[PDB]
Design a protein around this ligand. Structure first.
Ligand SMILES: CCCCCCCCCCCCCCCCCC(=O)OC[C@H](COP(=O)([O-])OCC[N+](C)(C)C)OC(=O)CCCCCCCCCCCCCCCCC
Ligand SMILES: CCCCCCCCCCCCCCCCCC(=O)OC[C@H](COP(=O)([O-])OCC[N+](C)(C)C)OC(=O)CCCCCCCCCCCCCCCCC
Ligand SMILES: CCCCCCCCCCCCCCCCCC(=O)OC[C@H](COP(=O)(O)OCCN)OC(=O)CCCCCCCCCCCCCCCCC
Ligand SMILES: CCCCCCCCCCCCCCCCCC(=O)OC[C@H](COP(=O)(O)OCCN)OC(=O)CCCCCCCCCCCCCCCCC
Ligand SMILES: CS(=O)(=O)C1CCN(c2cccc(Cn3cc(-c4nc(-c5ccc(OC(F)(F)F)cc5)no4)ccc3=O)c2)CC1
Ligand code: SF4
Lengths: 51, 70, 115, 156, 80, 172, 318, 105, 98
């Protein structure tokens, strides 16, 4: 039975699998230099990390 | 040479010896020339409270021998 | 009472050190000094974002192993018991089941980190 | 028991501490960093003087500009210096850092680190002999021997 | 199988030792003649008072005094 | 003295309240560590030490894992504290004031079987065996190996099954 | 009198931490073909005081991104616990006789990690967070084997008290029956302190300083001295448990002397090891402790559960 | 109880340590042991409906041993009256109540 | 004793209140659950020590065991939730309305 609350309701999927908004990756960016001892002095080395 | 290191080692050794000797001598000085009584179980604590009471002054290390039974 | 005394003495020593470290020296505060450190350049983001964990399963397992340790710790007393065969058998069963769980995790590659 | 005498002795003590314990920063840009190393080496043992390379500016007391300073690197150098806590000293090592040196007339070189940060001591050479850099460290030690801060506070 | 045990003893000796010690811990109690004495000792300790019994007059096997030669002796523990 | 155990219980209450106010799980784990420390203190003040040290170690490990997790799943750009939100700070202070009110009004209208400010410290250790040798708490917890063998197999199987279950849940 | 005993136990420990920094520098120097401090004082016995005074004379940092409360609490707690772990130690007589002294040690140590955690989180810098997570991993790695090693040893002592080990070793060290457990305990104490090869919490080659990177003179000094105090503490633990000083009730001074000798040996060994080896990768530490030490640790726990039974050598309860 | 498997096989997995009057380690005794024993022995063979009326005296003695509301009330009233007296100066605690006692033995 | 037990009961009730009154984060609710566990463990240990019933101390340790197992599976579910939505928020698992 429809109501003003159940108008936006959509019938669920046939396999219980829901097309879901693809949440993009959030990769921690880090300036590994310069002034870092490993970096031999003038290297910045911007890199992305998952952990 | 390598024997230039013995000063620091000797200093730290003295400093690490001080605590134990100090604790022992202080326990003796405060508990009547005896080792601080250990109360690991309630029986020892009962003994110590008995001693505290029977001793004229409330202190467990004043040992009362056969001089106090007649 | 003496334990309280010693621990509070240590609290006070540390706090005195920190007080005389924060109020004795001359200061000159400005934003470029008080700003975070990221190897000479400016951070591209905040450090308060999800830092993914690749050993989460091993940590979960560590919880249960800590509990098994909690159950193993009463042995010094359990060995003073008349029923010695029961204590022996139960301890052996406990340690063996622990090892079997660890082995299953190992084989199924739980101790290895997500990449 | 004059307060001025007491203050002079206290300042001697302050400077002795800040001097016999100079922790520089692992900040080497170019060739001159090699002579920095060699001054960390057995022949010239830095720690013998109380010198210790700490990698964080928030723990360092001095920074040796050991090589050429490009325009792409000057912001980071000024930032690191800014992040070092007072008292903070600076030492220019080589000819690249003092006045650009062999690359003075280049489009990508600052003709002196003294434009971006204030410099206490200049060590000339290309590269400066590690012995010379040590001479400069001790020159800095003496300069610190002559700070006379608390005497100034008492005279104010 | 000997070759497998051998290449494991060469490659992963830590697990070999672990299983061996596991088995020895599980076995040796079944082997020793001093296993029976653990419970006997843990029973010999008087953590409580030996509450005496009323002399009904029908306890011949029971002693009237500690130094009366009756009851459990601890010689097996005095010379063990 | 005499106010000792009551102060411990009140600190435990305040810790649990600041926890229930749900700030960033960092400060919540902090409050839980503090509450476990206070619980250890009070359990020691009632006679038993093994259980207190135990729960303390357990919750320390747990909050370690929880820190590791919240830094990865339960973090925010600006994590909330008790002071951050005026409403949360206000309800915290309000809860302290309400505890004070409840205590001071129960002492008056209520009987002494719940809160007796006069008579405090008289009922902690009702009875004791002055001549005793075998009263440590670990004796009971060791009974698991000899007498209460059922609890032991139960808990061990719970942990075994937990290993298998967490593996199955975390499978991708 | 008790406060005087507190002093005689506290101030020497701090002096020993300072001169331990000294001995560290000089030993590593002579291993590296160099001298080490000899300028500041006679053979360098004033370099630690110079460092400390200089630090407590520097401008500390109150950054803009930090949670100042934890940022300030963490070093307080670190130092407090580093000094509190020394109280229940028998040398041969402790200042605080605890029946569950081993568990006090365990809990206080497992607590000292939260100083690192909260420091690295408060600092609000990426390298600080990395150091904190590495500490999490390190603890998750070593804490499992620590307690089981210790239990397996204590199953011949009879209690968690640190003063029954003295009567247990009255005739013979606990190293002979437990040298495997002793080795594993040595490496795990090496890890508990974030000490090389396990200096991952402040790994300068990957993380400029780790949880210290935003910390400055005073609080940093607190962290550092806490580290160098826990070092001596764990050496003392090794040499009270597995190595046994001579206990003759009329001669506790000899006990303290030999205790000190062995502690110096073990600490110098820590420094030796820092000088001799590279640094692990913090996943390899987990793999080690969970694939070579934990299986063997369980096997030895079972072995030492059984040994008192098929030997009739169950220890006494007081 | 719902499935009395134990009472069938004749075992005891969880029922030998339910109440305080059960066998404790090293033959110690939980407090209120005798009160609990008497309550249980009275409530045996008659049911919980009768026991709520016929073992009421014993259950109440047990409840008082364990919770001790009445000893609390009594000592509180005594202390209250004594405080009133001292307030209005009609009482002085004897020596053995002020620390100064003959500490036997 | 009575004041201690009253305060521990009030603490359990506060932690239950927190568990019932959700906020955005789930781990906070898990922590409130752990706080309830703590309260109950402490109450049981205090009762067993006040009664001198050393046959009931094996109970609270089991309480802790099972509470920590619950926490473990909760953390695993939290992992899955974060993988799905990227966050541990509760307002995101509202698609089973149909
Ligand atoms: C266990 C840890 C042991 C280590 C800790 C032990 C440290 C004890 C050191 C004692 C020395 C006390 C004097 C140190 C003062 C240094 C502070 C400083 O340099 O500021 C200069 C300040 C500068 O004063 P000012 O008035 O000239 O500053 C003017 C404004 N500026 C700086 C911007 C130009 O002098 C003082 O005011 C301090 C007076 C000394 C007495 C302070 C108490
Ligand atoms: C046990 C936990 C206590 C549970 C009840 C909460 C009581 C404190 C609430 C007051 C607000 C504190 C707060 O969250 O501020 C954020 C701060 C974080 O820093 P901040 O965000 O307030 O930074 C403010 C900067 N200034 C100082 C310039 C304004 O953290 C704290 O202060 C509280 C940390 C919890 C520590 C609890 C142990 C206290 C130890 C005794 C001292
Ligand atoms: C305040 C913010 C900072 C907080 C950090 C403070 C440092 C924490 C240090 C870690 C402590 C965690 C472990 C809990 C304390 C140790 C408990 C203990 O050792 O036993 C308590 C002791 C009696 O113990 P026991 O010997 O076993 O009993 C027989 C004695 N005849 O005797 C006692 O009952 C004394 C109990 C008091 C325990 C000391 C706690 C002090 C807290 C100060 C704050
Ligand atoms: C019971 C009646 C509640 C009265 C209605 C108040 C509604 C409410 O505040 O509860 C929801 C609250 C979470 O609210 P939140 O999602 O954070 O959104 C911001 C709130 N303006 O939930 C919470 O704040 C959690 C409260 C738990 C702690 C309560 C202890 C209060 C101390 C007394
Ligand atoms: C290439 S290498 O292999 O050579 C490499 C090996 C490692 N290395 C090294 C080893 C130990 C110390 C240091 C100097 N150092 C000292 C401190 C620091 N020390 C104190 C302190 C507080 C109170 C003290 O006692 C009292 F003052 F009395 F209270 C004493 C000291 N606070 O912060 C902090 C950071 C730091 O680097 C350096 C040299 C170089
Ligand atoms: S001054 Fe010479 S040696 Fe130094 S960095 Fe420049 S070119 Fe290299």
């Amino acid at each position: 039975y429809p109501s003003k609350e159940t108008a936006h309701w959509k019938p669920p999927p046939w396999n219980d699998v829901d097309i879901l908004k693809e949440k993009a990756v959030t990769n921690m960016t880090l300036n590994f230099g310069p002034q870092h001892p490993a970096a031999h002095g003038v290297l910045r080395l911007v890199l992305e990390l998952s952990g | 040479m390598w024997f230039e290191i013995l000063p620091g080692l000797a200093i730290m050794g003295v400093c690490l010896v001080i605590p134990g000797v100090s604790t022992a001598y202080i326990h003796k000085f405060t508990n009547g020339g005896k080792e601080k009584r250990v109360a690991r179980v309630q029986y020892q604590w009962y003994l110590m409270e008995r001693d505290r009471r029977i001793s004229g002054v409330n202190r467990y290390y004043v040992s009362k021998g056969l001089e106090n039974i007649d | 009472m003496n334990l309280y005394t010693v621990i509070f003495i240590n609290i006070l020593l540390s706090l005195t050190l920190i007080l005389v470290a924060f109020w004795l020296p001359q200061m000159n505060l400005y934003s470029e000094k008080a700003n975070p450190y990221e190897c000479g350049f400016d951070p591209t983001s905040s450090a308060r974002l999800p830092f993914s964990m690749k050993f989460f399963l091993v940590a979960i397992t560590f919880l249960l192993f800590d509990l098994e340790i909690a159950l193993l710790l009463p042995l010094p007393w359990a060995i003073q018991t008349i029923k010695t065969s029961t204590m022996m058998i139960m301890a052996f069963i406990l340690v063996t089941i622990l090892s079997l769980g660890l082995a299953y995790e190992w084989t199924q590659k739980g101790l290895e980190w997500t990449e | 028991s004059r307060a001025e005498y007491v203050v002079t002795k206290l300042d001697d003590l302050i400077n002795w501490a800040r001097r016999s314990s100079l922790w520089p920063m692992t900040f080497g840009l170019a060739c001159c960093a090699v002579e920095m190393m060699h001054m960390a080496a057995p022949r010239y043992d830095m720690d013998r003087f109380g010198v210790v390379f700490r990698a964080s500016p928030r723990q360092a007391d001095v920074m040796i500009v050991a090589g050429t300073l490009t325009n792409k690197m000057a912001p980071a150098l000024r930032k690191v210096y800014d992040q070092m806590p007072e008292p903070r000293y600076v030492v220019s090592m080589g000819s690249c850092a003092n006045g650009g040196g062999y690359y003075h007339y280049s489009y990508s070189v600052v003709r002196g680190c003294d434009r971006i940060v204030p410099v206490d001591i200049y060590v000339p050479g290309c590269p400066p002999t590690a012995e010379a850099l040590l001479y400069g460290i001790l020159q800095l030690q003496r300069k610190i021997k002559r700070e006379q801060k608390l005497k100034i506070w008492y005279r104010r | 199988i000997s070759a497998f045990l051998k290449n494991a003893w060469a490659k992963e000796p830590v697990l070999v030792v672990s299983f061996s010690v596991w088995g020895l811990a599980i076995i040796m109690p079944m082997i020793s003649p001093y296993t029976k004495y653990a419970s006997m000792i843990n029973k010999a300790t008087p953590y409580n008072y030996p509450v005496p019994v009323r002399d009904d007059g029908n306890m011949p096997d029971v002693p009237s005094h500690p130094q009366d030669p009756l009851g459990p002796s601890l010689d097996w523990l005095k010379n063990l | 003295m005499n106010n000792y155990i009551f102060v411990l219980s009140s600190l435990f209450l305040v810790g649990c309240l600041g926890l229930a106010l749900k700030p960033s799980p960092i400060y919540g784990g902090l409050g839980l560590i503090v509450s476990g420390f206070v619980g250890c203190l009070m359990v020691l003040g009632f006679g038993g030490s093994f259980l207190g040290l135990m729960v303390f170690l357990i919750y320390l490990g747990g909050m370690l894992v929880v820190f590791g997790y919240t830094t990865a799943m339960a973090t925010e750009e600006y994590p909330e504290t008790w002071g951050s939100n005026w409403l949360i700070l206000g309800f915290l202070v309000l809860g302290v004031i309400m505890e004070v009110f409840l205590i001071c009004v129960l002492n008056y209208y209520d009987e002494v079987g719940v809160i007796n400010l006069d008579g405090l410290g008289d009922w902690l250790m009702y009875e004791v065996d002055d001549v005793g040798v075998m009263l440590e708490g670990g004796i009971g917890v060791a009974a698991m190996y000899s007498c209460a063998t059922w609890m032991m197999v139960v808990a061990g199987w719970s942990l075994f099954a937990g290993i298998f279950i967490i593996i199955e849940i975390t499978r991708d | 009198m008790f406060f005087i005993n507190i002093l005689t136990l506290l101030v020497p420990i701090l002096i020993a931490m300072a001169f331990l920094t000294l001995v560290e520098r000089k030993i590593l120097g002579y291993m590296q073909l160099r001298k080490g401090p000899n300028i500041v004082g006679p053979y360098g016995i004033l370099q630690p005081f110079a460092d400390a005074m200089k630090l407590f004379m520097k401008e500390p940092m109150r950054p803009l991104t930090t949670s100042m409360s934890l940022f300030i609490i963490a070093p307080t707690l670190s130092l407090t616990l580093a000094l509190s772990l020394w109280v229940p130690l028998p040398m041969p007589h402790p200042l605080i006789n605890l029946n569950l002294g081993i568990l006090f040690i365990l809990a206080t140590s497992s607590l000292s990690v939260y100083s690192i955690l909260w420091s690295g989180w408060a600092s609000n810098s990426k390298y600080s967070l990395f150091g904190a997570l590495r500490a999490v991993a390190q603890t998750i790695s070593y804490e499992v084997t620590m307690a089981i090693i210790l239990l397996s040893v204590l199953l011949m002592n009879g209690s968690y008290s640190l003063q029954t080990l003295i009567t247990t070793q009255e005739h013979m060290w606990l190293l002979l029956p437990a040298w495997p457990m002793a080795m594993m305990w040595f490496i795990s104490t090496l890890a508990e302190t974030n000490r090389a090869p396990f200096d991952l919490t402040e790994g300068e080659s990957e993380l400029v300083s780790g949880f210290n990177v935003e910390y400055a003179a005073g609080p940093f000094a607190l962290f550092f001295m806490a580290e160098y105090t826990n070092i001596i503490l764990m050496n003392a633990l090794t040499t009270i448990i597995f190595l046994g000083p001579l206990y003759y009730i009329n001669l506790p001074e000899l006990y303290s002397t030999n205790f000190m000798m062995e502690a110096l040996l073990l600490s110098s060994t820590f420094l030796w090891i820092r000088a001799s080896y590279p640094r692990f990768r913090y996943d390899q530490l987990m793999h080690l402790l969970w694939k070579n030490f934990l299986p063997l640790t369980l096997a030895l726990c079972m072995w030492h559960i059984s040994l008192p039974i098929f030997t009739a050598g169950v220890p006494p309860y007081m | 109880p719902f499935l009395d498997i134990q009472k069938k096989l004749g075992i005891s997995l969880d029922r030998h340590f339910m109440f305080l009057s059960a066998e404790q380690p090293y033959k110690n005794a939980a407090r209120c042991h005798a009160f609990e024993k008497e309550w249980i022995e009275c409530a045996h063979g008659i049911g919980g409906t009768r026991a709520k009326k016929e073992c009421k005296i014993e259950f109440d003695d047990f409840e008082e041993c364990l919770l001790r509301y009445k000893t609390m009330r009594r000592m509180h009233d005594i202390k209250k009256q004594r405080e009133k007296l001292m307030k209005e100066g009609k009482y002085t605690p004897p020596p053995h109540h002020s620390g100064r006692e003959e500490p036997r033995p | 004793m009575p004041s201690t037990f009253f305060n521990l009961t009030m603490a359990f009730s506060l932690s239950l209140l927190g568990t019932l009154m959700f906020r955005s984060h789930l781990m906070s609710t898990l922590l409130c659950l752990e706080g309830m566990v703590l309260s109950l463990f402490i109450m049981t240990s205090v009762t067993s020590l006040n009664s001198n019933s050393m046959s009931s101390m094996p109970i609270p340790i089991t309480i802790l065991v099972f509470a920590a197992c619950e926490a473990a599976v909760g953390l695993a579910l939290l992992v899955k939730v974060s993988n799905t939505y990227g966050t541990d928020y509760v307002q995101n698992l509202n698609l089973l309305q149909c």
